[PDB]
Symmetry: C5
Subunit: 205 residues, 5 copies
Amino acid sequence: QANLMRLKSDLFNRSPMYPGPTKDDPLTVTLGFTLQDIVKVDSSTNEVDLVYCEQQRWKLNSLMWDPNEYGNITDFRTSAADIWTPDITAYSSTRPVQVLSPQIAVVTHDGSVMFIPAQRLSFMCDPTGVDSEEGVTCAVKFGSWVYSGFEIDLKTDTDQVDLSSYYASSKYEILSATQTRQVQHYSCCPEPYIDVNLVVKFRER
Amino acid sequence: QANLMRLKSDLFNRSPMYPGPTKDDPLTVTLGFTLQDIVKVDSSTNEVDLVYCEQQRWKLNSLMWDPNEYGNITDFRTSAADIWTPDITAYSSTRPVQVLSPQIAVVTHDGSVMFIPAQRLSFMCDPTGVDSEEGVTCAVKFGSWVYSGFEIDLKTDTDQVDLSSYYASSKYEILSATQTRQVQHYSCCPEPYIDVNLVVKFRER
Amino acid sequence: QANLMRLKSDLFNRSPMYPGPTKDDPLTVTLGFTLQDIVKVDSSTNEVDLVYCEQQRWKLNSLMWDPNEYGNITDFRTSAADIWTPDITAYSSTRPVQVLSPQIAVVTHDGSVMFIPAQRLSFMCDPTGVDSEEGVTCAVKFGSWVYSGFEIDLKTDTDQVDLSSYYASSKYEILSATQTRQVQHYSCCPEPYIDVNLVVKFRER
Amino acid sequence: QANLMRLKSDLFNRSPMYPGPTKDDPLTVTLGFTLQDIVKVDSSTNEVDLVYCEQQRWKLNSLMWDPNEYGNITDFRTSAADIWTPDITAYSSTRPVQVLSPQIAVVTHDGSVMFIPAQRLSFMCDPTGVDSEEGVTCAVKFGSWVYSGFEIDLKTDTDQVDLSSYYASSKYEILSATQTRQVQHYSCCPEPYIDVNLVVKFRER
Amino acid sequence: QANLMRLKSDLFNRSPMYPGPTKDDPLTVTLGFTLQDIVKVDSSTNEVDLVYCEQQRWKLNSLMWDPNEYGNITDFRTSAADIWTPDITAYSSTRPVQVLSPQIAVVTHDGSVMFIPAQRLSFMCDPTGVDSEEGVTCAVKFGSWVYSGFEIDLKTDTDQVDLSSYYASSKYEILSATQTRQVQHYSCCPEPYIDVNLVVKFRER
């Protein structure tokens, strides 16, 4: 404890908080979705509810440290409020996302942070045909709300959504699940914008 | 970072916060609506639910800075809580507006601020006839809650609501969408009041 | 700004906050309701939902100032949290009142404060007969929760609820609307208690 | 004001806050329920909703003062957050209790505190037979969550729930209402546990 | 009071807060569930709602003290926010858990902490067959969200869920209830992970 205590102090009570990435000192955030359950489908409003864990990873130089200087410590857990976090946000949400897990992250000595909040999201999806065999396909983009590609770059470890822990007895069965980096430009603005497209095709059982 | 850190400090930890506009030092706020989806229509209470991003823009002298004095920085992102924000509010709301995006804004060196919160709003709208061909028209005014035209002036960049990102498979189809600056006077009080009238005409599909 | 900044400082960062009225130094609060919409009527629980703006006004000596000493400033806007506010409360509420507008008030140099929160309230009302022609009448009292008439006096500017901005296409039509000061003494304790009775008679359309 | 200002200061900004009762320095809390309305009855989950004011009273030595030393002041109102409050809690609740009134209490010079929050509570009650003439009887216990009888003693002023302000036109009619101090003593642990049993028998109209 | 005041001070205002367990200084948390009621079953989404108290217990060296040095005090109550608490979390939750009791814990002189929050949880459960005689079985794992077995060890006092205070007239009858420590390993990581499996088999009445 005494060691971790000093480390946490030296990391957080030292200089002002990290002000977030900038065009000059850009930052790369790695997304990974784990889909747990498609809970509800509302064919009268075309809202659909997912429960997924969203895995976020970035690295700050300002969070590095030598384990030899701090009792052979390689990593600690700490509150997501003790540190800067990427404003990764869903675009087609129709209700404020509900948080299902603790707001705690894992800072590692190389300066990498892993943060995996579990969430229940309601997004725009027309579930027409979900009762058929070929099913229905719906999608939702995730990305930063205020940062462009110049400041925050998004990257996936993989195309395949982690379905390993998908509710075995869900009302709905997953036919495919996809996380795909996309790069848009708007006319107005010369700067790149990055999202990850979450695309699940599903049906009743 | 070190540079942006100093800048943010010098801007925010220096003098007391901006006390808001006054008759003497007025301020101009620029509204733009982007309608994403008409989610729900409740014909038993005449509530209707929109999901839109609301683009706000104003310029404070107290937020200006020379990029040469701060490492060629032209703009940063920061929390909407670090700065003053206009009390732009919906008049015919029937439920507390739900916030869908992060509370983060973009301050630029000329002292301009861009802030674009995504919202789900429930307002008064009699949807009678939404199931016809000529559809139904409904409207809601947005403006300041406590500031008159003497203190806060509203302005639109355009008449046309941005429908470019309107949910392709919404239950409802947009026939027209309109943002219009309006100026209400009274005999009772010398002061102008300013609102932007959001007027969407829509139907089922 | 620089002026208003000083004023706000001298008013708020000077002495401790106003501790609220007392029998010795009483205070008079002026209520005015503006009924916007009767949104919902639940005949199975006898809950009814109103959306109104509630206009509150009081005067504190501790908020007076000479405009000549502060750059000809006559009034500013500021957060309802920067100042003391009357605990004016609904008695027959059945659900926590939802706030629809910003918590911002208007302090004027004579020491008067105007604060107009928009609210959605659910109160006890048996709507039996709302579908008839003579309609149904329901009521709800507003008053202080902890202060008696010795400490806080209530007063109305008028008997007539401001219906000027009542939703033209509401499901329900207002037949009459009434705000009335009432004084009820208790069998134990000599102090008067004061409420304003809100009494609307309404029907379907 | 100036007097009440000093008093409040000397009471609250002087020593650290009251740490709560202990076996050595026990405290006695007096409960009183006033039932306003039985709003809703859900026969599919056996949840029932009450709206009641819950009157709490205790006396702290640390809150005493001589009115002569503070401008003849006998009592003030202040925020429930400025002081310690008993963790009186409902045992069979099925949803987080909703608060309907301000969090303001009344401290009196003898050191007594009166606090009367209005609440909407959902508790476990099988309403089977509520549609009959003999009606149905349901109950819910209130007590401290973490303090035993050794630390907090509960007491009633009376057996009879205050029905004086029960909604005249509620969907449900009160046949009897009861607040009863009960003492569960366990052999396992030599300390008493105290609750007040709220027992209302009611029917449709 | 004066004594408990000093103790609380010396414990909390002395050194920085406990930084949480680490591989080097591990910590053991003891889970116990007390099932009060199965409130609701939604066969259209396979959500099921439980109301249970969750008993948590751990021991910190940093919380030890000698009663002789602090007025023979053996234990006090204090806010869960004054101290570190384990991030024990439900895995198959589908909605943010609602808290039903106060956030207050009991610290004892040996450094042990007891904390028993009451909760309403919604988890994934296919209730198909709940209307039969043999009933239906459903389960939900509880464990740390960010800590592995290297840092936080979970332990049960028993296999048997405390059904002693289960709602006598619930819509659903408990056939069996089970809390079982489980140890998983993963591919990604060398470390072990610990959960407690809550397994209740139930039916209608």
